[PDB]
Write the structure tokens for this entry.
Amino acid sequence: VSVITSEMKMELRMEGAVNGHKFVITGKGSGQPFEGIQNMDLTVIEGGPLPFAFDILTTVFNRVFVKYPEEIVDYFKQSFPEGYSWERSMSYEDGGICLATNNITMKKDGSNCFVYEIRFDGVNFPANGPVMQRKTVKWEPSTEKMYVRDGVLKGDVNMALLLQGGGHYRCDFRTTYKAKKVVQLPDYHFVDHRIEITSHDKDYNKVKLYEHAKAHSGLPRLA
Amino acid sequence: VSVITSEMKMELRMEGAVNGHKFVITGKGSGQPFEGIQNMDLTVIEGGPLPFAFDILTTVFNRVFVKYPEEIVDYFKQSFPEGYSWERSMSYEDGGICLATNNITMKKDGSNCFVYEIRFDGVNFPANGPVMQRKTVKWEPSTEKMYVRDGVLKGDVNMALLLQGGGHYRCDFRTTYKAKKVVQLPDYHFVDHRIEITSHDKDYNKVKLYEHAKAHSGLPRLAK
Ligand SMILES: [Mg+2]
Ligand SMILES: [Mg+2]
Ligand code: NA
Ligand code: NA
């Protein structure tokens, strides 16, 4: 049985470092779990102005916000109220790499609100690279491949940051999702994503985010 | 000019998390920079008993402790007293991966003491893997390849953890060393290493570490 409802909020706190630069970011928002859409506002409270592209952080700021077809098992909506946590490695093509974790829980006061505890760490970003030089434009939409591995769920996705001077900067995501309780495991499937920074101030101390995501079973064999 | 001396101590604090498990470790020791040997004692002050193999942390607990021949430029001994920092990605063959940073400075009192500020983070280690199951024996000795890249120094090394059930568990290190001041840059070279946990209690809350390292320019082209 799922305790998820049509309108739910989320509050989060991210603590991290990129190339040794520490920072803390908090955020709050709301989303529609069954429609796979969500929005939130982020605030850099420590470490601002960030010397790296804010885009490397956006996919860290919850797969519960995915419209899952009735025929596909929803690993995430089943996990609450206890929740789940996830770990992820984000390997960029120029050697830069980031690791992140998010422990997601649900308030039991009936406020239909998620709480995220996030850690983000990145190293080896070249000084003249698009991340440290903040030359990224956005993440392109993507299709994450979901598959079970040793009782837990893995999600792999080929990501790409569109660059200001044109062209793309690739990053490979390897995420492991871990439900805090026993839930039904899904068969191999996909989750299409489209994340966007809808608004931000000059130094990205204030950022508005939006994401639309929908799960599916791939292209039908019949045209 | 180098301010490095024969006998120097080091104090450190490591804060980190592995698969979401937080921990804090402090340590203190002493070493001989010119001889490339050092020893230290570590204490887990938070997060114990660690649920993962302590070995994944040992190479994070200073390339100043390397015997450098006179012919090879020593990027590290040149950097002090200001010091240097390093960043590293440690990619294991089963998908597990750790990132670490170490900011190294020298005491402000002439006590010949280094101070390390360390952050360690690892994720994606399989529950049944040698790290989470603590089936590692030790790191095998290694040879790190040092090369300059965009004004800073890179060090890449093929590492391997000997496992209890025999066989090895490979990890590829990618380190970037950044001097806090302008120093002379070295030509491509190598640093041989041999790190070992010389003593530890049952749950590794207390650990004694030793490392011997020496730089060189590779095998001579002429045999004999
Ligand atoms: Mg922008
Ligand atoms: Mg042992
Ligand atoms: Na399914
Ligand atoms: Na040299």
Q: What stands out?
A: Chain B is about 5% helix and 55% strand.
